[PDB]
Design a protein around this ligand. Structure first.
Ligand code: NH4
Ligand code: NH4
Lengths: 671, 691
């Protein structure tokens, strides 16, 4: 044991130091670790990216688990200390009677209290979580304070690296004796112990040892080794860790997605100005705003939107889902970072009781098994996740609403005829069902603590139960992200189509006017003020805005000045309108065709924007196509492809690619 | 290192211990002047202004150094509007699709206040108004967040609001109506402009109109006519939610320390094993909240006469004591630590918010821009109050578990059932009623642990499709604090009860031992003329038999043959008689036993009763160990300063009367100093583990 740290005796400063860097750098380190093919553990450096790497891998071929051999002496030392103290009399108050081996057998028999159902009707712990738990369980035994044989740690490592996962019940822990006893029960060859192989085949304990390559037969546990395995917070903390990996990734995604939302909405980028957020001090919103500011500062959509600021005073301010999104996301990210550190401390902790302190020569009893950090962190992170989801729902709701999305189509429909294309109306309903259930999951579990086990456990953390609900919350947030991403790419394509149609209408009107009316500048202006999609389905219609406003322009000029006056009216009705009705529908149609074939005169502004890597990922890597009632593809098929892309880890790289040019600093304001 | 995104400055706030953070906070809450300049307002100062009636308790003072930057942004607005415009809520409408344009600036400010006056006041005293303490805190914070010089309001308006604070005139605000704070803040602005419906209350609670409030407050010049930006600058802001959040977090930090201290007193009176606070156990988990909690409890227990005495006892009878301590005692540092971490982060987030610029648009004179944005979104308040409220609920649940162990004779290691104090438990149900009330407190507290921010509604033309609900959440956390004070009060009374019962126990037990040995010498050793080593070696065995039996299982009717004392003493004598060969001395041995019992029965009841009397008179032979313990200031505070007495069915006082005195003391601020005085000798370090 070391000495008291004079400059930081209670460890507040070292925990605060974990939070001193930027969130993005922390996420980048995290994902890089999850991509490493080796996880080497020694009891003090395990991070949530590494737990996620092992949980999503099937065996060593995806990620190999390695024990650090420099941990062997301290592990052995506390194992031998138990054995020597036994030989020369006895002592250990919590470990030692008359039959020692019988006590380790009974310990596991009565903690095997789980209900497995049929094994496949929803009452077993997923093997992904079993694996994560085995990893954390090993890591939290390598500090040398547990009194367990290194050889047991090596055998659990073989289970991880060959993909033999013991079968654990889904429920039964208030945080983790019961689920962990089924790992100890496989290690000891209990007759009811089972496991599954990489390929999903169910096997008994002896077949599991053969498949994993464990030699020497079943282990017979020494007095403290039973408690060392089953007594601990390994299951709750391990699930919490894989959840916090997904949470950090999706928190960054909602920052990027908020910037793309602004691009397709033609929002004013001023809401990201550093001064606004520096004056509130909150680092979460400062980083959120700088991240959006970076994307928007390299956006071709925004250079195009300022060109519209020159010839637009009946405009309206942006809504909160856009204008306050840094203020909204910042506090969620701050909470998620603190929960990550709490969990990362817990997966590097000694949480088995009693503690074997060889330096002072005593077994130290306490409460290191109380997984409060897991339950507190999971409850806090779950509510932050729900607030992130609520923001995506509100942004989604604005984006698909014609009254609010600044010239995009109703429901983001893409077809020539909106009467036979209701676009994302169905996905919008589904987004509300996601959001409602997510708000429900935002409720906490640690205010439902029961007085348990003869009222000996009158407080208990419920860590794993909380972690399970937060994992379900992450699932729903991934559903909302997938559907939102598809809608954003739809919006991008609609802006590309909008721009080319407007260009073709301007050229066409200019041409006909010069040929018939030999004041163009004000005809062009009348076209800017009307949204393309209010007339593009039938541009020649006299009851739609285009023809109605062009007529009104000419009628105004005539009525004011120029009484016959060279038969002014006849030039308006006959030549101009007739000529337009004849040429205009073919020109729009030719613009729609050029867009569809990738040969549009005005290139899609996404190609020149920092947000491009996400559009590319969806359109090229995943093969999702622009959605239109003229074809048969449904939005669910594209949402499903994105969702699976996210689960397989394929969105992380293009998400971070949006920010590859960012120096981690806000844009200067001082002058 | 550089800190471009401000993470390092936020992290540095969470360095240093919680106790030092709390000591600084309590000190600031006691300064008689609070001087604000827009960047140093802390929760101790907000709580000081909120609980003071006027400047005779705590005076608010504006920093004159802020007058130039306040004037610059104000004059910048006036120059720009004179020959220009295009500022939201200045030349344009408010809220959703505010395409409406107007030229009448002053008329626009009048209309802003009229339509934001949307609160329902009820009858004014039936629970639909904001407490005047919260109105004062909101006025302080509103001023502070306008002194950075970015809001375009006149300094003379800030001085007028300051005058309202220092004379104790508080505008009447509605309790509800904000999703976070236009509606409630428009009643401060409306009073500043003399709206016909504006009202306020004086220090003595007199409801007055706007004119009478300017009179009582000494504001000169008549009502204000707001300039274009000045309407928004007052109503746009998170000042109400954040002001209540700040006063809630002052209480939450104090009570978090209390739970740590009471957890140690719980171990003392329970005769728990203090090793659960050993630093190694908590160092190996890294969590700093648990390391500080454990070190705080270790310090109290390292200077406790209860624990020293428990060590000395266990050295002489190394047998016995296998039963382990239950979780509410043994895991209390692991339970509380994560709550303290959460509350510290919540406090720092609230402190940034009460020093933030939360109005729109921002007036940036150095670049000549009116920046529009979303600095009115009070998300830090709603998140911190939802997280803080759940932590408060977990703290309360621990108190309920510790209280439940303490009052149960199966679990409290030799204290009376229900902590009854009477000689006759049959006529003293002790704390049974408080226990039922403790469960009612706990259930409602757990309910309040649920969050509010997962109930956001798409509001105001769907222009406010996300909103923080900061004030609503602060109001629920304020109710959770109230309940936690109810639980803290009742628990403290029970803990002082248990201290006195340990005092009574030791003095009774001492008297039993002395009387038993005296009577065993006269009777069993007078027979040493013909049986020296018959029951001689049993003298130590009689004491051994007395120690293993709970005093209060026989303290009533101590010489009854049906109770454990006489039952065990006989069994000791009889066992030795027919085991040490009764045939060697059969006739005399058993007749001595009968004489021993009758001798004891003649004087033991009087000796036990005389021990009870000496305890109650304060002249007990064995001193109360609380006097030689670091926790003494809390016991002294309850018994001497507040006048709470030992509860017993032989007297007339009811437990609620004593709970109420403690609850009112807590609310009046009287418990902070005794609580901290328990830690006066702590250097902030855990005890060494390398020996
Ligand atoms: N335990
Ligand atoms: N606003």
């Amino acid at each position: 044991n070391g000495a008291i740290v004079e400059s930081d005796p209670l460890n507040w400063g070292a925990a605060a130091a974990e939070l001193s860097g930027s969130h993005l750098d922390e996420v980048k380190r995290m994902v890089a670790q999850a991509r490493q093919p080796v996880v080497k553990i020694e009891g003090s450096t395990l991070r949530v990216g590494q737990v996620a790497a092992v949980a999503s891998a099937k065996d060593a071929s995806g990620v190999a688990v390695e024990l650090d051999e420099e941990a062997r002496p301290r592990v052995k030392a506390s194992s031998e200390w138990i054995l020597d103290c036994i030989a020369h009399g006895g002592d250990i108050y919590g470990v030692t009677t008359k039959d020692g081996p019988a006590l380790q057998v009974e310990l596991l028999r009565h903690l095997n209290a789980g209900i497995f159902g049929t094994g496949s009707d929803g009452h077993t712990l997923p093997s992904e979580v079993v694996r994560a738990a085995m990893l954390v369980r090993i890591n939290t035994l390598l500090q040398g304070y547990s009194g367990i044989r290194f050889e047991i740690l090596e055998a659990i490592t073989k289970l991880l690296n060959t993909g033999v996962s013991p079968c654990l019940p889904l429920r039964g822990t208030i945080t983790d004796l019961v689920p962990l006893s089924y790992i100890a029960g496989l290690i000891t060859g209990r007759p009811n112990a089972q496991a599954t192989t990489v390929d999903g085949r169910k096997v008994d304990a002896a077949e599991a040892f053969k498949i994993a390559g464990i030699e020497g037969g079943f282990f017979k546990l020494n007095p403290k080794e039973g408690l060392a395995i089953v007594n601990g917070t390994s299951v709750g903390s391990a699930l919490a860790a894989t959840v916090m990996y997904d949470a950090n990734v999706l928190a960054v995604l909602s920052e990027v997605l908020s910037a793309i939302f602004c691009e397709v909405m033609n929002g004013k980028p001023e809401y990201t100005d550093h001064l606004t957020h520096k004056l509130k001090h909150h680092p979460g919103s400062i980083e959120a705003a700088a991240i959006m500011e970076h994307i928007l500062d390299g956006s071709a959509f925004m250079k195009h939107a300022k060109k519209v600021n020159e010839l637009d005073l009946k405009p309206k301010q942006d809504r909160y889902a856009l204008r306050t999104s840094p203020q909204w996301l910042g506090p969620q990210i701050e909470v998620l970072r603190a929960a990550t550190k709490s969990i990362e401390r817990e997966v590097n902790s000694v949480n088995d009781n009693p503690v074997i302190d060889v330096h002072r020569g005593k077994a130290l009893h306490g409460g290191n098994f109380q997984g409060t950090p897991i339950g507190v962190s999971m409850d806090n992170a779950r509510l932050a996740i729900a607030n992130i989801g609520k923001l995506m729902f509100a942004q989604f709701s604005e984006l698909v609403n014609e009254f609010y999305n600044n010239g995009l189509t109703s429901n983001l429909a893409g077809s020539r005829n909106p009467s036979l294309d209701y676009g994302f109306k169905g996905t919008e309903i589904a987004m509300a069902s996601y959001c409602s259930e997510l708000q429900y999951l935002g409720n906490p579990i640690t205010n439902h603590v029961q007085s348990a086990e003869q009222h000996n456990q009158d407080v208990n953390s419920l860590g794993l139960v909380s972690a399970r609900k937060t994992a379900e919350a992450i699932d729903i947030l991934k559903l909302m992200s997938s559907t939102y991403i598809v809608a954003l790419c739809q919006a991008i394509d609609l802006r590309h189509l909008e721009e080319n149609i407007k260009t073709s209408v301007k050229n066409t009107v200019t041409q006909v006017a010069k040929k018939v009316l030999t004041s163009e500048k004000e005809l062009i202006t009348a076209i800017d003020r009307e949204g393309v999609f209010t007339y593009a389905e039938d541009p020649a219609s006299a009851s739609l805005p285009l023809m109605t406003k062009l007529r009104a322009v000419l009628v105004d000029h005539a009525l004011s000045s120029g009484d016959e006056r060279e038969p002014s009216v006849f030039s308006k009705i006959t030549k101009f309108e007739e000529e337009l009705r004849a040429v205009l529908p073919r020109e729009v149609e030719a613009a729609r065709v050029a867009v569809a074939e990738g040969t549009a005169p005005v290139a899609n502004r996404i190609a020149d924007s920092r947000s491009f890597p996400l559009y590319r990922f969806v359109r090229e890597e995943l093969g999702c196509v622009f959605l239109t009632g003229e074809k048969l593809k449904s939005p669910g098929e594209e949402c499903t492809k994105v969702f699976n892309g996210i689960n397989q880890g394929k969105l992380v790289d293009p998400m971070l690619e949006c920010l590859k040019e960012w120096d981690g600093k806000p844009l200067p304001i001082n002058v």
